[PDB]
Amino acid sequence: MYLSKVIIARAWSRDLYQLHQGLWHLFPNRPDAARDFLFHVEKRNTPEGCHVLLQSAQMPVSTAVATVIKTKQVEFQLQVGVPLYFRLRANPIKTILDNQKRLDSKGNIKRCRVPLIKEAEQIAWLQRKLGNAARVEDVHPISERPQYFSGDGKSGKIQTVCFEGVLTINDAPALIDLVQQGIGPAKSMGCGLLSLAPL
């Protein structure tokens, strides 16, 4: 597992799709299939590009558009019952089936993921996702701008929520699994990266 800080040129950073496709070229294997990586956008505006915190299973190699600043080999050593700081940009949703009777490819009724617009439901979603791995001691749900994107031929939305707070570890391997694999949908759109720190 490798943790890095990467910057992407503005000309290759208009949509989250462009961020994904641009970050992709740091690991040349086809088809891996991958992503074996997660990332979190901290600064969105140029120059030089957009700053990103990239967790991966390989060592990134800088390209023309994607520039690595620092790289780290890291082993998460988590102890039980220890208070920690956490940050997680996530996509809290509810899969429901459409009030409009739109049709998918199979001729059945289409489903839609909808944002949870109430704090209680978001926090409930969070502690639910964590489960027996950890218990949320304190949480700040930061409301973000709705993100839009393009490609391949579809224009869609990703409403994100940025959780920042304190938690306590109950089970370490489960939490390591949560960090490594990611939490929630839109993992390719810069969600699911759980960042931890000591207080």
Next chain:
RNA sequence: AUAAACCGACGGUAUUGUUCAGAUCCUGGCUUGCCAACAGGAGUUCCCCGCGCCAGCGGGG
């Protein structure tokens, strides 16, 4: 097919050498951009795949 018809105005040639546009000059003095203002109602968020479905839960992009 007409004072028409047939029917070259043709050949040869550096415009050349010399030349500071120079010296003098504050654009200065006087100026509030002020008065009024919840962003809140909203769970739609576009494409696949697996398992559910008076519910929905996930995995990819």
